[PDB]
Design an enzyme around this catalytic site. Structure first.
Site, PDB file in Angstrom:
ATOM      1  N   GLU A   1      14.489  27.584 -75.011  1.00 11.63           N
ATOM      2  CA  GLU A   1      14.866  27.218 -76.405  1.00 11.63           C
ATOM      3  C   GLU A   1      14.813  28.344 -77.397  1.00 11.63           C
ATOM      4  OE1 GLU A   1      12.774  23.771 -77.888  1.00 11.63           O
ATOM      5  OE2 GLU A   1      13.482  22.531 -76.243  1.00 11.63           O
TER       6      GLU A   1
ATOM      7  N   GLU B   1      13.893  19.247 -69.868  1.00  9.74           N
ATOM      8  CA  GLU B   1      12.938  18.587 -70.710  1.00  9.74           C
ATOM      9  C   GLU B   1      13.599  17.378 -71.301  1.00  9.74           C
ATOM     10  OE1 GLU B   1      11.128  20.662 -74.183  1.00  9.74           O
ATOM     11  OE2 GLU B   1      10.616  22.449 -72.912  1.00  9.74           O
TER      12      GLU B   1
END
Length: 424
Positions: free
Chosen positions: A159, A333
């Protein structure tokens, strides 16, 4: 071969031992000392004490039938100053961790950077400085030299949108800057670090190399607002990795970015997979400033984060990625925070979390049945942990953690996942 049913964590969020065994400080160590940075005034010490307890934690995964474990290596455990000196006790810990995973039938799925930049690097400009990209590649090489004989999957970054924009633009994450030029420099040096690290990882023997991106599929009436949001949330890092260069800037009059010639060719080195992180969509309407979109309130039920529950968005997202990305996808995720309270019972009943996971697993398997090369799915998280600017006030785990005893108590969602993996 085997779909990777997995669970995910990161090092600063779970390990504790922040000052043991030669670990150097990270940006999050210094950020968590600032008043107001973390909602409950807490830090990653002791977190879940996983550096001490990892054997019992791995037995928890095995008891659910999890086949893969996504975790991060704390750069500052390995190179306490971020570059040069190596900390053999750091490497020995991950070496022992991987051997225990293998011995439990669990596939290690390793993230090299999950936000804990060595504080010594931040002092020299962190991700604003181009040198940090090169430091990152040398770190990646040191980790693969030790671990690539047994760890099949290495993801360079987790991320980078959060590291760049939360970290340097909104200030909600470490290192807590509030400057668009710094965020754009950081975005670019993250990507460059990724590209440099891919070739260092393959020269060191890593068999599958990838990156983990988060996505927030955007929905709205006005296509122009949807498109500005899509460029900011979904295309900013993925387009450079796919060799399309940066998308047209979502920002009004952006500051310059130090792109050297051939940077983008490094960024677009061939990968083995793309990691897809998804929690929620964004709903947008035409807005006006530096970032001209207005974000709209959730159109459905929301979690304790305020994030909309929209399992069809994971489907839409995978169908889009599956056409555009020429590598397999892993949902690295996906999870939800709902208020959990334990008052001593043997299972923590978390029906809203269970409902959220069941509908998102269904959406993802449907994307796969419709042609998407989706090869795994990882729940965030194995257990409640330090949730960055939320500290311990938000819980994503399948196992509840009573922080003071450090006891792990299964939630209904852990039992739901166990049965889900066994059915599959």
């Amino acid at each position: 071969e085997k779909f990777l049913w997995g669970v995910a964590t990161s090092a600063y969020q779970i390990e504790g031992a922040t000052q043991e065994d030669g670990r150097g400080p990270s940006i999050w160590d210094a950020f968590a000392q600032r008043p107001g940075a973390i909602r409950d005034g807490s830090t990653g010490e002791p977190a879940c004490d996983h550096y001490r307890r990892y054997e019992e934690d791995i037995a928890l995964m095995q008891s659910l039938g999890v086949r893969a474990y996504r975790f991060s290596v704390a750069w500052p455990r390995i190179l306490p100053e971020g570059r040069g000196r190596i900390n053999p006790k750091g490497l020995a810990f991950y070496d022992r961790l991987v051997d225990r995973l293998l011995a439990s039938g669990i596939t290690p799925f390793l993230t090299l950077y999950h936000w804990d930049l060595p504080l010594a690097l931040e002092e020299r400009g962190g991700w604003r400085s181009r040198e940090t990209a090169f430091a990152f590649a040398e770190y990646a090489e040191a980790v693969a030299r030790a671990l690539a004989d047994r760890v099949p999957f290495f993801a360079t970054l987790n991320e980078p949108w959060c590291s760049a924009f939360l970290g340097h633009w909104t200030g909600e994450h470490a290192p807590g800057l509030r400057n668009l030029e710094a965020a754009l420099r950081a975005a670019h040096h993250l990507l460059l670090g990724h590209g440099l690290a891919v070739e260092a990882l393959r020269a060191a023997g890593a068999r599958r190399v990838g990156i983990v991106l988060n996505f927030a599929p955007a929905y709205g009436e006005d296509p122009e607002a949807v498109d500005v949001a899509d460029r900011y949330h979904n295309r900013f890092f993925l387009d450079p990795i796919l060799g399309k260069g940066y998308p047209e800037s979502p920002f009004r009059d952006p500051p310059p970015v130090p792109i050297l010639s051939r940077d983008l060719e490094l960024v677009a080195r061939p990968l083995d997979f793309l990691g897809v992180t998804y929690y929620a969509p964004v709903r947008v309407a035409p807005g006006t400033g530096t970032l001209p979109v207005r974000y709209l309130p959730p159109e459905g039920p929301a979690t304790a984060m305020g994030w909309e529950v929209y399992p069809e968005g994971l489907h839409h997202l995978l169908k889009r990625l599956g056409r555009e990305v020429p590598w397999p996808l892993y949902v690295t995720e996906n999870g939800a925070a709902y208020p959990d309270l334990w008052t001593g019972e043997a299972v923590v009943e978390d029906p809203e979390r269970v409902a959220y996971l069941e509908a998102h697993v269904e959406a993802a398997l449907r994307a796969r049945e419709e042609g998407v090369d989706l090869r795994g799915y990882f729940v965030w998280s194995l257990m409640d942990n330090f949730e960055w600017a939320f500290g311990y006030t938000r819980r994503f785990g399948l196992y509840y953690v009573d922080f003071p005893s450090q006891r792990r108590i299964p939630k209904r969602s852990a039992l739901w996942y166990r049965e889900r993996i066994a059915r599959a």
